[PDB]
Amino acid sequence: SYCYNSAKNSTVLQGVTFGGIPTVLLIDVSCFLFLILVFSIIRRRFPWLTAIFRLHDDQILEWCGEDAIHYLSFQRHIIFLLVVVSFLSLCVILPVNLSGDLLDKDPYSFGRTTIANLQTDNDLLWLHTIFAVIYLFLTVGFMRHHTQSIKYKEENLVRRTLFITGLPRDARKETVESHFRDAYPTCEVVDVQLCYNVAKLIYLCKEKKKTEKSLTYYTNLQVKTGQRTLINPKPCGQFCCCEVLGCEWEDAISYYTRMKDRLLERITEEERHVQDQPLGMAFVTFQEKSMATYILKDFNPQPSSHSRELYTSKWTVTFAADPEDICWKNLSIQGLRWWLQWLGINFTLFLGLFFLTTPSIILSTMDKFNVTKPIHALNNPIISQFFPTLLLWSFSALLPSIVYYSTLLESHWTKSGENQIMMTKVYIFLIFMVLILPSLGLTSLDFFFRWLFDKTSSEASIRLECVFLPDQGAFFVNYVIASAFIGNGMELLRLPGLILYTFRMIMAKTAADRRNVKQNQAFQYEFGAMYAWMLCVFTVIVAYSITCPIIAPFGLIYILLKHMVDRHNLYFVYLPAKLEKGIHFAAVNQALAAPILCLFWLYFFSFLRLGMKAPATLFTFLVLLLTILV
């Protein structure tokens, strides 16, 4: 007498053969091995497994980048934490999940190993919650240790210049200087430089420099070949093989000369206009940092004779960044528009997340909507267990470039806030794209299915105690394996990278041009992107640790697959480390979110299964609140 009672001589449809995890795994590893085979061929063109069998931790610091050492230290800390949690979870909590009767002890159903196979009116889930908290301390300790592995000294002394926003457009340098003298007589200013709408000027000068580089290339090509080169200036104009209306061929030197002259005219126009358009922005540099900091905490003000006309109450004052990194070309989009521009991008990118992950989930349950005909209808094990998973992984792989385009479009101010904020906005969107939003989606899908089939269609309401993801949450398990074998081997071969390789070698000017292109063949290692990827998959793993612990070992494999691969990725192909120390600290403050999410989702599923009447729900609420506050 347990959930999934029966149908008329047809059993049930929701059950799956061990969530289909083995077969996809086999398929996955096959592709992985397939990829590694190609890898060998690639390395025979541009086994080396003995290298990873032989790599050591001294030569990497001896010659390669310094920050790669901290990245590998974080990788080692994560692998140790994951192996500890795997051997601590599969030992106790898997037998605890198996010691229940909601799945009727069916032979090869995934749900028998998940939290779904656990009585709601029990005390064993207390262990869950206890388990769900001890992780924190464990993880915290490990993360704390990793901090002591880098212990970067806090030195960011760029504080002699203050960036001030909210100044009136009619403000003058003399007036603001007099205001600072009056409000802060003990504080003396060396220089005030008002910011104007130069942005448009920057943009034009960037296009001039691009045009000149192009002109110099075609002039040097003529001089070398004696031939005039015709070009098509339309998008994709290289692929225009035929004189069709819209594929006009022009002389390259004549085109780029005319473009340069038109850009020069517009630059000279804009240079006259530059003052007329101030931003009400200001930079105030100082002899000493301490007076600037004094003004800063004072604002975080002292009246002057020039307080009223300068609208001092509307100013926002911060420490000015490095003058060589501040994006002037993105400073003209200040004001509420920027804030609106904010919502003008992420939200639509948010609406992107509903159009790439929701498909996959649908293919996961495209055969589980009739909630009847329960006679082994299911689907081919290739699809609905693997194909949606691979599709989700591929969309996640395409996401970081989309986030790069979005961050460029939203036009931030400081270049420093273009990689740390980049990593944060890739990690958050990845979490919202694989872990939280898809899980909520298919949990609500199971709610719909249960309302369609379980005791509601016949005479009553929903028996909500046995509510869980369809395939009993097998899907993310596949994802982890899809991120471990096919995903990691795929990342090893860098198919976007090799596509760029082939697309740059095929499209050229001369057949024998192997000298060029190869100069930019290798690219800088994007520590932010790979940190965000590892943290996204780690959140997917640890989030379902107290729940559906079969993922816990599989995710371990992932990080191992990652570890070795990134070692190779940090020795042979990709460039050495260059990034700053802030990214690693942010990544340290990133893994702490995974067990918090795990606690939140354990509480969420417990509250979904059983109401708030039981003291367990109240205990989960209070403990989640206190750990979140701390």
Swiss-Prot record:
It is found in: Lysosome membrane; Early endosome membrane; Cell membrane. GO terms for biological process: lysosome organization; surfactant secretion. It catalyses: Ca(2+)(in) = Ca(2+)(out). Changing G487S: In HLD19; loss of mechanosensitive ion channel activity. Its main location: membrane. N-Glycosylated. Residues 475-506 are annotated as: Gating helix. Glycans are attached at N9, N370. Signal peptide: none annotated. Keywords: Calcium, Cell membrane, Disease variant, Endosome, Glycoprotein, Ion channel, Ion transport, Leukodystrophy, Lysosome, Membrane, Phosphoprotein, Transmembrane, Transmembrane helix, Transport. Residues 150-336, 411-415, 507-526, 572-581 are cytoplasmic. GO terms for molecular function: calcium-activated cation channel activity; mechanosensitive monoatomic ion channel activity; nucleic acid binding; osmolarity-sensing monoatomic cation channel activity. It is a multi-pass membrane protein. Changing G100E: In HLD19; loss of mechanosensitive ion channel activity. Coiled coil: none annotated. It is linked to Leukodystrophy, hypomyelinating, 19, transient infantile: An autosomal dominant disorder characterized by marked hypomyelination on brain imaging, congenital nystagmus, and motor delay manifesting in early infancy. Both neurologic impairment and abnormal brain imaging spontaneously resolve during childhood. Monomer. This is Mechanosensitive cation channel TMEM63A. It comes from Homo sapiens (Human).
